[model samples]
Target: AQNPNCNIMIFHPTKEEFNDFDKYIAYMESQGAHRAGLAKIIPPKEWKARETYDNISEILIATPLQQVASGRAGVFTQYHKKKKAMTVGEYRHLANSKKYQTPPHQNFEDLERKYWKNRIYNSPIYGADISGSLFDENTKQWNLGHLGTIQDLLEKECGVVIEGVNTPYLYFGMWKTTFAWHTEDMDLYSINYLHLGEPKTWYVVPPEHGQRLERLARELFPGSSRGCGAFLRHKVALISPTVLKENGIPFNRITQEAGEFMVTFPYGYHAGFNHGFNCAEAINFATPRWIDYGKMASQCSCGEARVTFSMDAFVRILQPERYDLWKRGQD
Candidate 1:
């Protein structure tokens, strides 16, 4: 069952507004929507993705979770043991028919036998360039590269190619395949689009409470937090919203269906799980206001965080003459 609390705001962007990426960006966070952290967009049902699921022609493998209630990033390690490889076709064959049940209160809690949750982990998905990049240039349909005004300012103006930052990547999920709680890379804003399959339930903590969530993680996993600052960025922590409320943290939930979009604000902490088999694509983007996040963002010494680009380098290149508004936001 989902947390019986508030869901994020959902917008109905008519086909015309949806097609004009710039206009849509202008309309998105202008009116207090940023406070919610995650916002939804359901474009006109007329629009559909041009790509097909079969594009991921190759097989992919996923890792299994060992016993524990999901812990902090530092301590969450050494949880999964073996790598199970399977074709995308084979994945759906099992997940679509498996006796669906909510993920255990603790990971691998049943302990029916060895490789119990291990087989459940075989549902393959995610990681960069698994099959091929999800980027398509031919269409104006929700491309992150073309979405916001300042997103390209880092690459198109600064002459740097941050592969995952500027480009879209594919993610596959199955029933109860839950993603961990974490903020976006480099604290940049992110938007995810559901191209095909069943809906995903999202949990988002607005920036105001993002720190509270971080404190809770640090308290729960001292070893992890001791290893790296803001270990939540490790993306290993997972706690039920019920627990978060018990700790006095705030979180919001929303269900994102096929053809819907989820946009996360800067420093927004979010996690989610798939209801069933599904494919989604996501990319990181930044607007002028996003520069504010980089100021307070911790530079994790832990190399595993996958820092995409350098904010200092990006700010150094900002030509104050023309980037009047963008530079001023940093000051």
Candidate 2:
């Protein structure tokens, strides 16, 4: 006989049922909320008396996803094929020309003005912008061109739904050598797709298993690993909208014409873009929450610091009264 794959758990009951805040706490524990990941998890046994964060509207299972059907261009690479791959000189010429004068949607105010003026669902920064930290103006534009190519591919081909395209797409200035560490963010199940020459390094540790790996990476190569000397989580998977797992870590040699995996992002706490340099076609969708996930819209600001905030650390900053305000507070 075949086994049934139907998910028994669906929409979770609302928080209103439990009169006392601690009642929901008992319910979450009873439901095994802490041990929800593929990896092992254990919640603090002692009652920390942490502020209650109930308002549960949905069951927290990771969404299912399938890669869009598309064939890769023979050998030049998808990034090479779809993108114009302009040099600095060509980028300057194109930008200076009337045809390419319109800026890439980097500014939140500008993007809202252009795309979301009339509609209620304006585009939030989707962690899609390239930074000019090392590159000049022309190089930055060229980077955006590459990014846009991947973004278009995702929209066109990578329609594997994960939590229904999280709202207010988050964006962050690209950085190197930083790992956000292993910790879930505010019930958000995220999918990060890479579009760089190198792999968008993400060291993901599965619950307790990664702590050892992170310790080894740091102990053997101190000053090499970041994040309070924690074992950087292992990046168990890599994905693309059109070309699937053709060229990424964990599957560096594996290739498929098209792939979109519904990774258990909601269950795992993974870090991002570690090694030499990489470009990513990353986005995280959430219904509504206090703050949207980590993002840095402006270049070279505290967004970098914000991105580095660990899950445990970020919860520290999330004020009790200000939970749902991060969505509307955006300009």
Candidate 3:
């Protein structure tokens, strides 16, 4: 069951002990990143005002911003500027179609990327090779300089790459680009690293209250579907966390700065807005505790079940490892 109260956690790792995975795991399991609460891991002070911070910006510039405008690019919106929803494709056409030096409306290019600032929001489906040599081809792992975290471990152990889940994805947003309320798939965990960006504000709902909120949403916006999926769309009523808090629901607020990692636990509902032009990398992973959850979610009747990987495959790979560890009295 989810905790009735909403809580967000943050961790600050030192320069000398930043890669301490065991401590990270403990914190994650507690009130940090892995629990049914929002968690953030702040970078060491040494990196904050150092060259490493500058390099993050340099690496970000290599990212192919132009590719985001392609017809096949992932879904995005100019909803902040237009106050209307348009798919990325539709938005692109509208941006390029204008021929005149218009005054009432800005050109599309002006409305996207850095020019548009926080107006355009994009989730680039394709992995840009511009991770600043972040990944080591020989090891098939991200370099430690990239702030490698639990995501790297989960991908290595999982033995499978699930796009938008185990695999890495990029989010680009100008000011006010919103990611509406939602939880992770299969009740798994998610980690978001603000590699370089302005702060992001998050509203989180604990697991216990997630369903209740969904039910309330269904009643308040009956036309919307009875699930979290519809909550991301514009038609759904955008309820504020304060409203929920005022009505006896428990939730917490957090602002994630650049060089920090935000982790969302399984079944936790969260929504947020990017404070300004920013880029972040996010990926999802499942811990040992989520094995049964993964199985159950795989069999769910909802459309989400259609997109998940084969749980049978996961069990096959995981069972032997678990047995071996158990035999050694490690479980």
Candidate 4:
């Protein structure tokens, strides 16, 4: 009853609950993303309680990420799309600097301000996908076996095909590296697994209230074009839960620790920052029910929609499996 409507739900699953990956996958599938409330999983067996940040410097040095010479842009920076990216060592130094501080939030007082970088690569970190490949190709060590997670199974076996938008990507964040308020690409759900590092503070507003937040954002940032959608490009200003609460909107605050999974439902608006330097991996996925939103989002203003898989193509591939499932159920 804590979260009555299930706008947000947290689960602490025992090892037995996750030992059979297929069972876990089936559970999440039944729990529909976007339509259902956000769910956070704390898997006791897979997530180890240890200090991972102390060795991060060594980890980044050992792992190879896209790098550029000085005067070139660093991939971790927001402007990298139009410019070059910063090197690992360079980003590490800047992250340790004082200029970037965790944006002050109402729940968090006297927060240590911080800088952050996202070392993004086309491939999933450790050469793993949602099917639960926990091996870190860079470290040559097995980390968390996530092949059993719901999102992984959906893509691997559910016929939820995608060309590029659904692939997993890596994120390396330091304190105060901010991802502005936005929904997942194509309005699909996303799963973020914190492989290691400091805790990440989150702010989530349910999908039903997306338009409300968008209206407020327009009123606040009058100069930004409404046609551009809810979030800001280049720079995203802070929209604290405190501000939303005063405006009569409810939001949930979660501090995601290492070894935990944060599930963002379709159309759910979420934003967060790293407490300190950390490594995280995330990917997107959809279910049979995602068809309508998939088509609608493509027509919407969010730029990701345009780049996502074609709804017609996806439906063509998915309908057969859906029909088979229906037939079996009838049997």
Candidate 5:
């Protein structure tokens, strides 16, 4: 009953199956799952988390998020330009407040599909990088950090705290807040963990289709992609699956529920919206296979100045921080 072409590959791993993190990822890739651009991991039932969020929610209540305001189409691009800084408290206030709530005739999903700015508020907590805070002070740490899976080769090769890109970013998604279509910086792999709340729907295109998607984007919005071939770096463009299907582009859909992990492969174009108010944290990572992708990215000439850890230095055989099995790629 599963359609590999359309549905994102889901792996239900037990404790032993999930424990060997890197090996598991390799196995998935070996099975040709990498073509999907991402995969979902639903951990064993025995796995339970210990987040201190509920008891200490206000740690970020005053933290204002610059949530953009868009039309009812949920598409946030250069054309749909607007911004309103709001606190998590106010976000909750407005969500619970009927004033901006969807009308009786319409629905939340419809309104959110049209109004993306009002829905997703992505704010990376500066000090709350999943190290000291964020997790329960006493119990298990959700190793969504560098020391965990995805084998984040960035910081290891860089030899310093690279700040934002190397750290974890927390997200608060509510009622159709959309994360526009884009690839990870430097074509690095990205891992997302759904902490708590409703499931987040993701639409991802294979690495091969990344170009066609770009072509369609350029055709649809010539002004945006005209000079900057990587205009999607702005992360303002979003597309519906219906449109993707119509374009003959292959894609997969996955719903990330609470306590699930999702991994996005290098150069994969992914975009999606949240089903409801949810909390998620994510970080960028890389594997030995990413050297060529990183090299290929330099030619993109993006408008935004992305942070780099030096690909040549990484390839020059500098001693990595923790791991030692780093092998150079073939030309």
Candidate 6:
């Protein structure tokens, strides 16, 4: 089926104010997000004995640690930054004529030595479009360029994956501004899991209504509002996606650091803001399906995770005969 009326939703979400960690974890488990991979672990008590450096130690102490290779960058990331961002022409001029050395972010004499040796290459994503232009292919190491040798090796070991192309791109970063009423992004559901910081207040608005809500938030809520507009009202829907950072909230995808948050989209237009304390580091990831998660196509029951239902299914749920607030539209 193209759409499987499935979704993720959070329960007993930790607010910035909760002092008891056990109660917090309990509520999240009661909600469906934790069950759907939104949460990795929910210790009965806070992880007080764990230390940050302990992360590396645990990895090494594990059995079969020797089997893992000492690795460099991966296919998704070669160099942290590029030298030039030009596309076609400027690339030729620099690589063929100017032959300028690449820029550096910090103190590293090694990079400078390679620049003088005329052994550097660049990539557009890295800040320049001149990748694979220079360097020898035999040694599998280039002073001023990417390790194409490594890239090829990775591709051979692991199959390839595609992301997107230029022109007519997808807008994954769309945000809206309004809290006028209760609405949902039917396609997805979200839950924030805070690992090391305080909580946040997320304000969700329907799509096509962001600008309006943005205006409303700026006018009415002032410091309290971040996205929606002047004619809308904001509510604290999901709170404390993380353990509360000491400063501004930090939201990102889950990491090896093992401390991340989960945000299920597909549900609708939503946004977030800090609450109790400054949440500096919070990460997230989300599952694709919402309603039909049983691995079998079946009618939904009330207790089932409420993902975005189909239009027909949605209509049935409202049953205009009961609410009368909704009316069927004619084609």
Higher-scoring candidate on lDDT, 2 or 4: 4
Q: Given candidate 3, what's the lDDT at residue 40?
A: 77
* lDDT by residue (tens digit), candidate 1, 1-331: 1212434667888878877765676677665566778889887777666665566535463442322334332223223334466666665565566454334343322322222234334432332223234445665767654554344555664565433325565676666565778888657788888877866788899876788888888887788889888677667667666577788888887788887888898888898667667778787777767766754665454554544344434434443332343334334
Against the true structure, what is every candidate's RMSD?
7.9, 20.8, 10.8, 9.9, 7.3, 21.0
Candidate 6: C-alpha lDDT: 0.26
Per residue, candidate 5 scores C-alpha lDDT tens digits across 1-331 of: 1234634677887777766667777877777667788889887876655634555344353333333533333333522233354555555555444543333326444543443444433321111123222334342323655334222364555444332324566776555456778898667788888878766778899886789888888876677777665678767777666667778877877678888989998889998866656678787777767756765652333424233444334323333431132122111
Q: What TM-score would each prediction reach against the true structure? A: 0.73, 0.27, 0.57, 0.62, 0.73, 0.23
Count clashing residue pairs per candidate: 1, 22, 4, 15, 7, 63
Give the CA lDDT, 0 to 100, for residue 177 in model 5.
Answer: 57
| Cα lDDT of model 3 by residue, 1-331, tens digit | 2222345656677765565544564545655344346777776765542234333322333222222221111222212221233333333233333321112325333322332232223432211222223223332211233433333444565655433213555565544445656666555677777766456778787765666766655655553455434443232134555457556666676778787778787777787665545667676655655555544431222232223243234433445443342233311
Regions of candidate 5 where Cα sits further than 4 Å from its true position: 1-7, 61-90, 99-133, 136-142, 146-165, 298-302, 305-331
Q: What is the alpha-carbon lDDT of model 3 when measured against the actual structure? A: 0.48
Q: What lDDT tens digits, residue by residue, belong to model 4 across residues 1-331?
A: 2333445667776766756533554476465433333567887665352434454343332232322111111212222122234444555665556653234444433442222122122111111122222334333111333333334434665556444323455676666555656676556667787877667777777766767766776766565535455344323444655567777765676778888888777677787667755667776666545545544542233442233233334433445434343233223
Candidate 2 local lDDT, residue 273: 30
Whole-model lDDT per candidate: 0.62, 0.27, 0.48, 0.51, 0.60, 0.26
Q: Compare candidates 1 and 3 on lDDT and give the better one.
A: 1
Model 6 over residues 54-154: C-alpha lDDT tens digits? 12111110111001111121101111221323332332233233223233324323332332232112221111111122122331211112211222322
Assess candidate 4 and give its lDDT: 0.51
Q: Give the distance in Å from residue 181's predicted Cα in candidate 1 to where it truly belongs.
A: 1.0
| Deviation in Å, model 5, residue 247 alpha carbon | 1.8
lDDT of 1: 0.62
Better of 1 and 5 by lDDT: 1
- What TM-score does prediction 6 earn? 0.23
Candidate 1 residue runs with Cα over 4 Å from true position: 1-7, 51-85, 97-138, 144-151, 155-165, 307-331
Clashes of 4: 15
